[PDB]
Every structure is written in structure tokens, then in C-alpha cells.
Design an enzyme around this catalytic site. Sequence first.
Site, PDB file in Angstrom:
ATOM      1  N   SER A 151     -83.056  -1.611 -13.524  1.00 13.44           N
ATOM      2  CA  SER A 151     -83.573  -2.595 -12.588  1.00 13.44           C
ATOM      3  C   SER A 151     -82.851  -3.926 -12.770  1.00 13.44           C
ATOM      4  O   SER A 151     -82.475  -4.309 -13.884  1.00 13.44           O
ATOM      5  CB  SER A 151     -85.076  -2.791 -12.796  1.00 13.44           C
ATOM      6  OG  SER A 151     -85.565  -3.826 -11.955  1.00 13.44           O
ATOM      7  N   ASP A 208     -94.177  15.944 -12.775  1.00 10.69           N
ATOM      8  CA  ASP A 208     -93.851  14.990 -13.837  1.00 10.69           C
ATOM      9  C   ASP A 208     -92.331  14.821 -13.888  1.00 10.69           C
ATOM     10  O   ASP A 208     -91.629  15.685 -14.426  1.00 10.69           O
ATOM     11  CB  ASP A 208     -94.406  15.489 -15.167  1.00 10.69           C
ATOM     12  CG  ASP A 208     -94.083  14.575 -16.331  1.00 10.69           C
ATOM     13  OD1 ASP A 208     -93.606  13.441 -16.114  1.00 10.69           O
ATOM     14  OD2 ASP A 208     -94.323  15.012 -17.476  1.00 10.69           O
TER      15      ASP A 208
HETATM   16  N1  LIG Z   1     -96.617  12.163 -19.092  1.00 11.89           N
HETATM   17  C1  LIG Z   1     -96.989  13.568 -19.147  1.00 11.89           C
HETATM   18  C2  LIG Z   1     -98.512  13.674 -19.214  1.00 11.89           C
HETATM   19  C3  LIG Z   1     -99.247  13.845 -18.048  1.00 11.89           C
HETATM   20  C4  LIG Z   1    -100.632  13.933 -18.102  1.00 11.89           C
HETATM   21  C5  LIG Z   1    -101.286  13.840 -19.322  1.00 11.89           C
HETATM   22  C6  LIG Z   1    -102.817  13.938 -19.370  1.00 11.89           C
HETATM   23  F1  LIG Z   1    -103.364  12.719 -19.085  1.00 11.89           F
HETATM   24  F2  LIG Z   1    -103.232  14.864 -18.452  1.00 11.89           F
HETATM   25  F3  LIG Z   1    -103.240  14.318 -20.613  1.00 11.89           F
HETATM   26  C7  LIG Z   1    -100.550  13.665 -20.486  1.00 11.89           C
HETATM   27  C8  LIG Z   1     -99.163  13.579 -20.435  1.00 11.89           C
END
Ligand SMILES: NCc1ccc(C(F)(F)F)cc1
Length: 330
Positions: free
Chosen positions: A199, A35
Site C-alpha cells: 500500500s 480464505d
Molecule cells: N484466518 C483463518 C481462520 C478463519 C476462521 C477462524 C475461526 F474464527 F473460525 F476460528 C480461524 C482462522
Amino acid sequence: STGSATTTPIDSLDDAYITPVQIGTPAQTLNLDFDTGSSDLWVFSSETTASEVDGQTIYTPSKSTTAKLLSGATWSISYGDGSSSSGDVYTDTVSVGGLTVTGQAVESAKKVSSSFTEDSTIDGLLGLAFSTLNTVSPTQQKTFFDNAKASLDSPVFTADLGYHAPGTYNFGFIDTTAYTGSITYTAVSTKQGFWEWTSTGYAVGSGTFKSTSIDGIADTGTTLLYLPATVVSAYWAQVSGAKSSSSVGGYVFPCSATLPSFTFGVGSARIVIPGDYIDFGPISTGSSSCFGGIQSSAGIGINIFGDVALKAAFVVFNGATTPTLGFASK
Ligand SMILES: NCc1ccc(C(F)(F)F)cc1
């Protein structure tokens, strides 16, 4: 040193991508969501409330001879979609694709929100934004990338996400066989802790390119592309029958429609997102209304170049003392 790991979509819509990570001694392999929009490495664990675990692989610190409890440290995070988790903190050895960091903070979840419980394929998150966003208290902890930086051949990592297909995260080198043409680099602002860039504009389908500055973040942890209301309206206006639906929470379109491509500018270069990438399928099983992959950021407060945009490019996250982002076609 370098590392290279394959990343795989969790479902047929590319809702998220998981990458295997080795934690502890002997290794416990968990599949983590890399992430670039957050800065915590947290995992489902033996400490997680049992009712909040539904099929995830858990990290068990007591079985790792290199795990150490970080005395009195805690963490708590809330994500832009309303998800959250919290717990305590170990340090342990963490390896990604052959690249090993010792003494990495591994945040052990005691509590997770329901959206993580229901995602049985995601065992945790590996944050790759800047360390100023890390939530460990009272002593802030460094990301995996920050800990690895000094050992890397080059202080970079690259994201090569696949469309309905596996892809690659590389650490420490740029694979010149993975892209075509040249890489265009653009300036990064770290003032909010994100990989934030500007961008240079956009085009819808074969329409004229509109030069306009769009400030946003490169976020591998967000599925969709969130852009200003004016831009999103211009895109969906070209799709017969598309409309914004409050009950669904965004733009939907008749599943039989063909979608136009979307182009975004990186300096003088152009990255083209094929229309097929913007189709996120029926809103409910059997429905003939489909969910759009480009949505308005007006409620979010920040523009987000999520997986829809990033998977159309080879993306270089350059963590030099002055950081930059690189984009190439592929
Ligand atoms: N952006 C961070 C994030 C990543 C995945 C999820 C989920 F979908 F797995 F809950 C929530 C938040």
C-alpha cells in the site's frame, strides 16, 4: 467456464463470511470460509472426533461415489490466531457456484481446535492463497483455484464482500457492473505464499494523506485490519477516549463515539473505509466499551488487510503468470 457464489456474513458483526460449496457425488453442500490467507481446503467430516463437532454439517466420504482416499497423506495446519486442525485427505469433485473441479484434494479433519468447534456456522475453510502453502504431506496438493485455472475464461477471481449484507465471489470473469470508476492494479509478491502487496499510504478521516509503504497481505480469512503501530496510534488518537487495553488485547473506544474513516492507498488510487466499518461492538454484553476494527500488527509480524478493508472495495485476485491485485471503489 465461470462460477459465481453468494457469500454471507455469519453474524451481525461480519466476523466471517460463508459460501456454499458442493462436495462429492451426489452433492453434499457445506458452508465454507473462503480464505485468501491459506491454501488448504479442509472440512468437518464423519472422521472428526465427535466431541469436537457442535452443529457443523459434516462431509461423509463413504456416501460419495467419487471420493477416493489419498493413501498415506496427512495434513496439519496452525493459523495466526492459534487455531489448528489436522486429519487425512480424500480427492473428490468440488463445485463452487456452477464451476466444477474433479480430483480436488478435500482434507478431512480428525481433530479441530476449540475455536472451530464453537463456530457452528463454519463447516470448513477453502484456501485461496498460493499452493506453496498447502500442508498436505508427503505430497503437496493444489488449491481449488489452481485446479480450476486452466478451465476459467480468465485466470482471476474477485471478492465483493458486503457490509452487514451478502456479497459475491466470482471465478473466471470480472463483473463490470459491480464497481465504479476503474480498477487499479498493483504488484503481488508470492515469496511467502500470500497475496502480498504494498500500500502507498494512508489518511485518517479528512486528514492529509501520508505517503508511506505498507507491506501486507490481502486476507479474506481475517476479520480485522492489522497495521503498523505508528499508523494505528494515529488513527485511534482521533477517537475521544480510545485507548489500548492489555486485558482486552487491543484498542477499545467508548461505544457512543463516532469513528473517522480510514483511507489506504493503492498506487495513486484511494480506498475509503467508512468509520462504521471499524466498529466491532461491545467487548462484552452490556458494556459501553466497544472493540476497534483497526489493530496493531506488532505482535503478528505481518500487516493484514482483512475483511474490514476488503469489504470497502471490489477486489480482483489476478492469478496470471505474473499475479496482480486489483482494487476498485464500489
Ligand atoms: N484466518 C483463518 C481462520 C478463519 C476462521 C477462524 C475461526 F474464527 F473460525 F476460528 C480461524 C482462522
